[model samples]
Target: SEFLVDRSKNGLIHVPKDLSQKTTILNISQNYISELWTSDILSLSKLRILIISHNRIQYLDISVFKFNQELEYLDLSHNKLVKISCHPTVNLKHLDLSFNAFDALPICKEFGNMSQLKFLGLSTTHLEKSSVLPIAHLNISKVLLVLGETYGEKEDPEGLQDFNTESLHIVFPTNKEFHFILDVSVKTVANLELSNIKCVLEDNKCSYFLSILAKLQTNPKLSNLTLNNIETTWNSFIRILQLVWHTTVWYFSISNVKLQGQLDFRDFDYSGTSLKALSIHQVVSDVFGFPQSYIYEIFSNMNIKNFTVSGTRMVHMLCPSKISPFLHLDFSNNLLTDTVFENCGHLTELETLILQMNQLKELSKIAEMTTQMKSLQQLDISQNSVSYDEKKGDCSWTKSLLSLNMSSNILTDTIFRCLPPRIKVLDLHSNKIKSIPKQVVKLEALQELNVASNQLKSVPDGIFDRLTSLQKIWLHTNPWDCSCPRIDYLSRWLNKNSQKEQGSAKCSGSGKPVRSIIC
Candidate 1:
């Protein structure tokens, strides 16, 4: 016999005598259970998983779980738990205590001695120096620690030290008290994420905070690092990059930084650097200070595989004559034009190019420039000014392109014939398309298609025949003329595979809104 309790039934106040011996799993989440009595858990000796989240639990007795040797997971998240009392269990592996009123670390003394606890969640808890020191003694091989919206400075320093985990994530209200990170020892850290870093460039506080980067070089195993909301001067930012390049880092990113002063990178060194992936986003560059050549010098002699510089207001064009080994390049949300790729033909190893949200007006200009990129697989030039009249000739130059995005442009069905037949994903939404060309059904490898929010009136009969690989089709919000008999066959096909579409394809001519109406 098995005993299962759910939200539809009464709240659990006492353990039934019959289920005291055999119940292995108990989930009472999303219920009106406010308190857990010691008698309710005394007989649950065989319980392995217990989920009491999403309740009104504010108090828990530690003696209730003293002999629960088989309990491996406990989820007490999304409750009013302010203090918790737990005894060292033999096999508990996971504990979640997030979204509570924890002004300091919970009062669980077993955290330092739980030998099998591999995962701990305290994202919404407040931590003090004395409270977090218990984590240093945790013997779990790999651990993830999250401190949410922390404040104060002097006490944080003590908590920063003695981190013996594999990953550490810390969020703060400001960067003023974050200077303690420079003194933290993280020789065992492999991934680190720091957010809300306040850097005042005018008072040299920016340079002081960057000293953490120089200090992190001592961590031989550090490979991935992310810094968000870092404000600094151009020279200070460049110095940070230089320090990052000199370290053993392989992946680095900086986002939401307000930069000032000249944008110069002519003196930075890239020799013998292990940098492989670099991303810079939402950085404001100084006006009329330097040309694009100075920006290009920062990547000279670097063997980066993935690079991104999005939302930086970049307008200058890159004309590098040397061959680059970039596999992915994303320069979206800039002020680039058709001449943006005038000198990028030598990047033959390029596989993904994202130039969305730019001023590009013609697809031929990009196709002509990327002729040498034989390995190109994905291209996104969406949200531009591209039109159908700019179609030059056959698009055989991009035979290897597998995915393309030209949505929100002034395009028509005339450009469909020029698309590469090997594309697997095609996005043409929010355009001036009036009809689906019969040639589109020949794209045998097409899997995902987006043509929503267009001026389509009717679809060609047998247009979607024999397309076995087609999976997703977004054809809603179009002025579909349901009066035509050609739509009956299309409606039948849509009904046969109705799960592929998101919403019902509405037609203005129909009086009642019907989903998958077969004429």
Candidate 2:
């Protein structure tokens, strides 16, 4: 009889004596079965498919399967089996032993004789690191998936084949013993270890392969490399950038390299590469050679989505003529000003721009540039100064900007006069402002307002009352006289949304200081 059995909820499953002769398929998944070591399973002569996934079967005895001659498919995934030993002469075409505690592949010599094996899934099953081989060498050996650490010897003068040219030149350049080891790891064997690989310069001190640009030459499959904490000169840095300029590396992280020369990547061929994220930090100088012309060349290349260039102030100018529209750009902790955005014909596609924690005196130039960037949504110009100018209606930078972060900037009510109507989140924390004016409440789409760390003794009543869409307010760290008579419409709005005031703001008024008051 053909039957389907699911012992998912039942723990103690007693095998019926009738399941002995006919070819059968049984599923015991998602149950509390601990052991499958009984003589009842050894007599199943015609059983074909057996699935026991997601159960607590810890161990299997070899004696229980001494007789089953026609078993084909066996699946025991997500079980608690630590060590599984099977007879070599048994015929099994398909087998899955995933999510187990086997420290290494079984040392059975008969496993090599599994000529009929077609499909085997051993994911998350720890295999011997020594047994893994490079996919290139394995393919040469006519094997699909090879495992183990296999390395051969190359010529070396002093037997020191772990140093990069820079490090070796720094200390012992004349030493004939120093040689370089090209640590090439291919697809399969690459994942077995942290792919953030480093070339051993000397000793345990290794210099990470800065970029995968060169590996794409031979493999044509390498992408997403992590080159961490490697020092390089100006020439070497640009050389590395040029090497990977053509490869389609989706994610690249190169930081903490004390770059003495400016990074000029404008010439990199980024048309074919899908570079999405990048971190190039610690830049010491401007464009190394021929500053202005070469700088634009570096900026024009590399079409990136999320880009961070920080920790160095080598760039003196961030002119709009230099920046094309970046999807998400972060030039934080750099020497930049609003003048950089003066004629920004480049940032046409820019949506998010983070220019925080830098020296920015005025943003009038940026306001002028925003007229061209219609897709701009989030703009973080925090920790800078955007001075107020009498030039009203001079800037046509009107777009649907949803969020604006002007935190730690020296801004006034004049700066808000030209704010786009579609503004939402406005962070004015740590600025120099005495009191918010009524004109500031005209932003109809404004959702959140952060005016903390100011010199305001009290706010004008009804300033926030007109903010119907306002949900969160951060109006603390200002000198406020919280007297009942002094409480205006602003206080009424605070009392209404007082439930949402906790950890959301600090109090300039010293009453029984309550946190966020949600209405």
Candidate 3:
């Protein structure tokens, strides 16, 4: 005897009006049966398991279970049941009461009467501290108590707190009230303590805290801490870090401090063994009055490896002398002018430098400056006025630079001679060059050449013939007169190695197969 019906049938029955057949389980876990009435239920006397989870059952009268004596498991989770009271029965063993509205434990003091009850999952019930619960006796064997953190409470505000996780020291600055809460918790467990401190922004008060995770430092080790909107000057920011030098923090972020361009670190020291990666964004720092000698003194022998500065303008504050010793620097989105590179003659260890979106007037010193950067692997100086000039090519410079990006700059053929023989990737797209210089074919190590959006009418017969390592050539956005005699060779070569082209090497524009060049 089984009660099987489609709840979507306006409470209609699937089988005969009355189910008088063999006994089976009534499975209706996914349906909308708000109330069970005689007009909706079919007779299923011998049913053992009735699953009604994931439904909209609001009012299930006690009479429904009056005849379900043979039922072994009842799942009524995911419902809107406020109160429940039933006669004690030792036959029903498993009950799922998860995702309900019972503020406290659904079971009463008489719940122990269900001697056969073993699995009772009541997770996510939102029981607070005032909620009543029965204490389990030591003799209650096989009883697993799972009180997840969803019921835990946080401390109010107070003093600075300190905790240790692995080898990292978590420094938390708290207020007076929360300090007591942290002290009690720290005595029992190990966690960084934060004191109560505030920083103002937009005429509003905001709090801040820090946590050090020592175990996170697996390799050379690194610690991370989140800060509130505390506006700190260059000196103040570095000073606070120096004072909180217990743990080796490699990553740091100041939430919301507004500032100008140049980061002025006067009485601060970059002498640390663990501060490796640095990222500054949004938080304003002094950009203009860059004390040059101080910068050179600190970075000359520093262990800091990666540096990132974004979302701010420091045009007036950028000084060439301040960057001579920087190994890897980024000045993206800054108003840095061309004159900033005049005195930046030495950057021997610099492997990568990004100076995009800056109004640089010229790049006359770039090729010469790059000559000294033998270890340079990447250089990004896009979106600037620096163009190719014949007079700028003075003494020939050699380098092992692998990648160079001079895109968005008004470049000409004179830029060809400045190419490092070891350059594997060169981006010269979006320029005013009308032709390709034969000197470009001398780069035997060139792998990818992007010269899109140019004025070139056609490629020379042997333009890339000597480029033995050339795998791709980007020449899109150019008004190409493809009727030249060399067009046949270029077409055949592209079709021959069709599969080798990848990443910024796809053809586009003239609507023909050889009509456009990938930028």
Candidate 4:
């Protein structure tokens, strides 16, 4: 006898008296049911879902829900609710109060006793600075609390003890003293992010905050932790790593954080840790003159799969031993010289290597180093002075390579003689390339080709005819002879796949553009 009382027919001032005693759901949304009579609600003893959203419900009797003993889901959203009250004994599991006129956190003492309540939403309620105690007192598993722009906490709330919320999102001023709330939420909150915090570490409060992070070892649910723009001491920063070193944290990052000395993880044992990814950004290290040694040691000892070291200058690049099991390494935006690969021999299992924006002058040394990297799939050495002079045809070592980026390098068409035909993405932009031989189309797996900003006058006829896998091609900024028949063939191919080419397949001396050629 589960029933649905849809109010879309309108003009419903009272609930039906003949409703079955076993009716489990009552959906009275988008109607004129402004009030709920206690006798009308008591008739449905087994009601589990009650939806009265988008109505003129400014008042509700607290005892009305207490009478309907088994309500599991309640939706009172899109109403004129200035405040709300609930019975502590009701067994509701989900409640939505979005799009209301509540100026502050609603006073619902019954939320503290709602053991089965798991999810609560209060978005777009125009919340002001008020006590979030009602939320912290609940046994909720997930909660979203939105506040106004002028809301700031002078002191952290104290009643959030044993608040076992698994996911919590609060958008407020980070410069205030509200971060102390994390001390209460430390053991329960996962995926924690305290962004735009402009506090210094030397302050006693900030120091205590760092000390609290050391207690994350007891937090079994600590998986993702992010701290942005925090000015802290080198000691506090090391404490963070040390805490996460033995914990089960998988993803950790520290960006725009001030530090003084170098990080040494040699004294710690990370062999049994669950850390899989680590990222350090904009941190200045004075040890080993740079922070590469720390990165090398972390990768060598721990079985970290993904590691990134960006925006930190290296004194001199040194390779690590062959004890690494990393699958991804992003060492971009560093001051690496030509000898950056002096110790890349041990990185046999590395699949992705990004050495972009370095001071490399040639690709011959890199090519020699990558000869034994059979597992290498994606390689990016762009924004370097990479040029090939010797006609080395020994590129069979890169048979497993899938993507290669040699853009902004001083390369010519001769470099393509050694490229593997199995590669998918080939970026040869900003080079002195004059002609693309017929062998270029032999790359059957080629999906993207970036040949822009070159000195090409014409392409070979039907060079791209059989490239069915070619989806994205960059052919702009090249000198094209529109009068050549080969150019006419190129225009025909571009017109055939005009939607896939995205209007980027145009010639220089165009009459009606390359796509409009009537050949």
Candidate 5:
């Protein structure tokens, strides 16, 4: 009994033969359509998802999807196709002809009899080669290659030889042969392997491949690799992460890399490779500032369960003479402080710690680093500028925390009686809280509360039957001096749980809508 007919952005230019044969999802994207008439979608006969991409589609009758036989998904991207014909389909699994106007991608039949094909978006097809001969019976898993405005006289990578897809996304807009077709995409997976691989060096000389990225050996199924905006040289980014530290890339990312922005890490040692997650953003280092011993020699080499070194210019987080398996440690935005983990016996089995935006000014060093983060469940000192004193002199935090993202910082409301009384998500939204006391009903395991946009006018008096495990509450960007009976009981408790509010709790200066100001 499928049914959904989202007609996105009205301006559609046709293709609406009054749909509804019990459509199973049909979104006519940002409309202004331009032909797709297989008699206007051969009767959506249970169309299983068909979103016509950024409309103005042009000529798309790949046998009008062999009659919707329960079409699995089709998004004809930014259409205006210049050619398309090769349908010996399957349950029609996602066939997005990306940013079309194809210059080539043809053949008769083949495409490996559509055996549950998954994903094949020919990105910005300006191609003139890499002849995807209708995928000579290709067993697809994922494919999105490059751009080729007369692709430098195709130097035979034998048009993607026996392209065995398991995940290969290449995009090198310029950077000589970006080492061209990478040894025929590394010997076509040499017997099935390669779970995910992505390369994008828009080009400023990305010498392409650290020895063909260690040519897929020891490096099993790529796990996940992402690279971007390269400009190499710090001995080629430490031999491209020592060729991604030996391999089996669990999860890796390299963004905005540069070396003239200042970098010279002459110490390379990841001798045994161990990454379950390594995210490096805005990459720039070596001004005698950030190089805290190259993250203290990448946590003394190994055991990274999840590590994010954000935006670069990092300011001292040096730790690791031992005791660091890091479950999730992110130094968000950098210039961190509050005495970088002032010895939490090396984050005792750390659960989650993302120092958002950094410059930690001390809210009693987050209750003194959760008294040695006894398996912290989540802590993101949002925005950070810290410093809270509702009459300081308290400690205790990390009753195995359950989520604490001190939104924006510079807190108030007397640090809600030094929080974490069984925390279950508490993000003192935007801070400078003007009220809400009674130790906030001792947060009996508060179930998600954000104190929206802080600086409240009134709200307290048995806060929702004493925060009884309150199930989600953000109470919109505060300033609620409702001009009525002191917020007529929070405008009738936000008009009886108005779906556990999240944004509009209005009332300040008669902006109304506090559930129609009942007073």
Candidate 6:
């Protein structure tokens, strides 16, 4: 049902000659091809998708594309093509020609007849009205218009008057000249820079250009909005929140925003909102400038499902006293400690918790917190300083948790004592585990286990005795230095099911495969 010829990054001067006529997709990217000869794909009429990106392709004999009438998607980005002189295939629905040597938009006289066009990539060039007007009548679903330093005065919103697209991303645009084209059917707009809006806020004309953000309140199609790489004061950021407070937008994300000054969300009348999923990433704010409670209180009354607050240097989060409606919470890539969830019993309903790449320790306390989170199924506590006390009693955990990722921790064999009782998929790779005790055999429900890249020289006696349900095990990359007779304990089991091993497991001294030497 699928036939794809992938020769990407093969360091070739031309497309390989070994191609089947039934190949529907050919990905020959990252090569040294300067010009695409006509005979390269002379018989590939069934080619539907061609990804020729990141090559030195300067000229393509326009005749090379005439035979592939079935080609719908073409990616020629990051190349040196100066021109395209062929009448495009009628079935060309996606054509990306960005990052090329185009002095202006590639004008095609048959663009009107290519009605199946849905995506156009005209980025990395100076915008011109005369050239862009040629393809403005097509019904494109997505278009990326990354602009260069424009000294010309022709590229205005009026030039894109009748242009229709479901999503339009215009980067480095002149903010004063930027506006939502009312006649265009655009639902999403991205890379809307805020450098111009920051300077205009100094004078009392504060809400002058700011009201433009308040412009899409009536547009029903403006549901998914993203504000990235914006730096401003806390009050200026609040205005945008206040504007979209009552709208029905579902997904809202603001990444790489650096805000200073105190956040006085004291009297904001934002009682009603329709936002469901929100993401705030890389927001470097002064400690008290934007308190932890500011983010929670903004969507306190609203019913949100998924929320993320990563890369914000947050130490501790203040959970509301009421029950949380969130199901997925990502607090990764921060400075969170073991005291992070000391008082968050309200997060019992959260199903997915991501605390990876944090400064967490005391694995017992982290596991004990899951006792209240009965709904958590997948928990990622990887890439932290996680360790447990083997002398202490076994810790209690959420019975609903089926998959747990504890890779890249400071754990030894003591980690097995603090794990959930019903975990099926367990990852303990990249730890300091010198040995896995027979106590792990109690996990009869384990179906997948990974202890690779650890300090394990060998397993304990009869490690897989009771783990009958285990179908996959990764034991490679460990310094195995056990005797052949000592490894003979796994001879019968390895002969019965050598397919269960993920990779090689050989003795370090004799350099022999455990399964082969024992047999």
lDDT of 3 by residue, 47-104 (tens): 6766677666554443455565666676777766656664444355666665555544
How displaced is residue 332 in candidate 1, in Å?
3.8
- Best prediction by TM-score: 6
The C-alpha TM-scores of every prediction are: 0.71, 0.59, 0.56, 0.65, 0.34, 0.76
Least accurate 10 contiguous residues by lDDT in model 1:
7-16
How do the residues 1-519 of candidate 5 rate in per-residue lDDT, one tens digit apiece? 658888898898987887768888989898888877667877777788888888876565577667778787788777677666655544556677766666665333534566676777764333333555556456677776554434434455455555666666665454433454444233344222221222334453335455556654453655677777665445456657766777766778777765432334646665576467878788664444455445445443446778887887767665555677778888798787787766557767888988899788868766776677788898888998886765567756868888889899887788877776678888888888898877777677788988898879997755667676778888787888887788787777678886777778686778877888767
At residue 416, give the lDDT of candidate 3. 83
1-519 in candidate 1: lDDT tens per residue?
445544323465433345546767787776667777666765888878778888777865655676777787877777777666666545578877766656666636667667777767664334455665666777544444444445443344446566566665555455453444434447567777776666545566455567766777787788888888776566677778888888888999988877667655567666667888999888765555334556655643346788888877676556544677788988888787877756456677889999899888877777776677789999998999887553377654467889999898988888787677788999999889988788887888999989998998777878778678988888778888776585687677777776787666688667333355656
| lDDT (C-alpha, whole model) for all candidates | 0.70, 0.55, 0.52, 0.67, 0.68, 0.71
Backbone clashes for every candidate come to 0, 33, 37, 0, 3, 0
Off by over 4 Å in 4: 1-133, 136-159, 162-164, 168-187, 195-207, 262-266, 284-296, 299-301, 314-318, 341-345, 391-397, 438-442, 465-471, 493-502
- Model 2 weakest lDDT span, ten residues long: 163-172
Q: Over the stretch 48-80, how does candidate 6's per-residue lDDT look in tens digits? A: 998999998876444477788888888888888
What shift in Å separates residue 356 of candidate 6 from its native position after superposition? 0.5
Task: Report each candidate's C-alpha RMSD, comma-separated, in the order given.
Answer: 6.3, 12.7, 12.1, 9.6, 16.5, 5.6
Candidate 2, residues 1-519, lDDT tens digits: the string is 654455555564543345535646766676766677646666667666777778776675533555766666677777776666655446566566655544454333443444554444343223333333221121111111111122113412222122111111111111122233433334322111121222323342222343323544454444454454445445456666656555545666666554444434444445565567877776544345224445544654456667787776534434334455468878888776566555656677888878887777666666776777778898888877766564755445557588988888777766666566788888888887776777787787788888888786666766765777877777667776655555554455666675555343333555435333221
- List ranges where model 1 is wrong by over 4 Å: 1-109, 120-161, 172-178, 202-205, 284-293, 296-302, 333-335, 390-396, 421-424, 437-449, 459-476, 484-508, 511-519
| lDDT head-to-head 3 vs 6, winner | 6
Candidate 6 total steric clashes? 0
Superposed model 5: Cα runs more than 4 Å off: 1-210, 214-240, 244-296, 299-340, 343-353, 356-363, 367-379, 382-413, 416-519
Better of 1 and 3 by TM-score: 1
lDDT-wise, the better of 2 and 3 is 2
